[PDB]
Amino acid sequence: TLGANASLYSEQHRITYYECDRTGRATLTTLIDIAVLASEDQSDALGLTTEMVQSHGVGWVVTQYAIDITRMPRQDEVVTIAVRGSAYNPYFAYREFWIRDADGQQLAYITSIWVMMSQTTRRIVKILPELVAPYQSEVVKRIPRLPRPISFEATDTTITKPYHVRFFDIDPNRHVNNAHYFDWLVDTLPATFLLQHDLVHVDVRYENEVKYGQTVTAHANILPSEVADQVTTSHLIEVDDEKCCEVTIQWRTLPE
Amino acid sequence: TLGANASLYSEQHRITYYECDRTGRATLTTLIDIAVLASEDQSDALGLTTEMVQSHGVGWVVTQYAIDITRMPRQDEVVTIAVRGSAYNPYFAYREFWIRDADGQQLAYITSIWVMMSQTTRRIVKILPELVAPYQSEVVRIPRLPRPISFEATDTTITKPYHVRFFDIDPNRHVNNAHYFDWLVDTLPATFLLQHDLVHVDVRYENEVKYGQTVTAHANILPSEVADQVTTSHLIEVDDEKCCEVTIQWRTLPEPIQ
8 A cells, every 4th residue: 555654643633612613513624724733743743844844945835635524523522633644756745634533433534745845946846855754655656646626617606705815814834824725615605505515525726825915716616416415516716817726525415 | 809719720722833823823813712612611511511501591792801911822832721700790700711831821811701691582681690600700899891992993094894704603603702803903914913912902892793794894003102012993893883892902023023
């Protein structure tokens, strides 16, 4: 199995009321927040701190997430977040995350693709082996492919809402927290849709960075699905018609 | 001392990167979030859950906050949140909170006023002693908390609109009071925020904000007589109706935080 011998770093996290939505379940923003928390803690423990990575003239940037949701963590549940830098090729790193309950049953499974961005030239460079080696990552030629989100196009029922990038959207690394894109994406859908649908799967592709003070336009299409008791939502986050993030979500329709 | 015999409930909390702003320090939203987390856990441990309080046709609604900030918790700091239902009178309940560091030194001190609002009629009902007795709160007068500045708009007032989001409505089907700080603090520009630290905060909640409403946040950056400080006077409204009035005291830093 790819990355079987890579380190599996884990930690426990109590899901707070403020990390949940009105149904008492953790939000997508929270799911990514805790996934990245485990990854940063693994990295810090190996001496791969944000300051140490930045001292090599580079920075890690996530390009894609593929999320399989069995059930979202509940309010006051102590979940286990496990993370693994499973693999890498010259330009891409493949990182996996597991969110499990106290018994170890899988709640969410996240796969991701990360690139190494040069702090000076602002372009993708080869992965510095000293910044991946500590994770015990498996070297590969072909990095695993994550399913691309639906290329967003306008429809007759397209929901559009503006959102301004706030000061609190910028986390300690001086860039916008990617997790906050879900605040905009999910809020585009009406409360009625959100209260009678559960998350099944999410495909995310980060295309262009959104910066402080910019106004993003979040677009959403509620589309039909071939799978029974399911619906698909196609989303786009853009600034001045430049595509920043594309997301496709598979939901399951609740009975009542 | 007001509420000496009242029970002291405490817990530890690890400040995460996502609970902090760009300077690696906890936001005001996080500060209130963890204070209220300590209060709900004290209440759950004593049997006073959100279900049994709501079974009596009533619910706690915070009307006021006075926050004394020595320093905000830092990213990855393990802070101790101590809480106490100090005292109460026929209508108002006085609740205190202490945010302390790993070595026991005080980071923040929060005082507050709470009232019981009916579920059906939506009026200020009398405090039921059964819902306060488990905290061991003394029956009292409750001193008046420091009032915010009465907001007056001027030619230089900073105004920004904010829309209430789905995630702003927390598990009890109401817009979480902590999220008001997202609007209040964001009204001020990053150039101000990056060279100012929190010293004090006063909050008055007049009217609750609901889902689908567009709030209008106002802010005046004012001079202060206190050495190395400035004052910001804030107002959150929903179509010519006061929702929240806030006054924040800040310490001007020698250099901006990169």
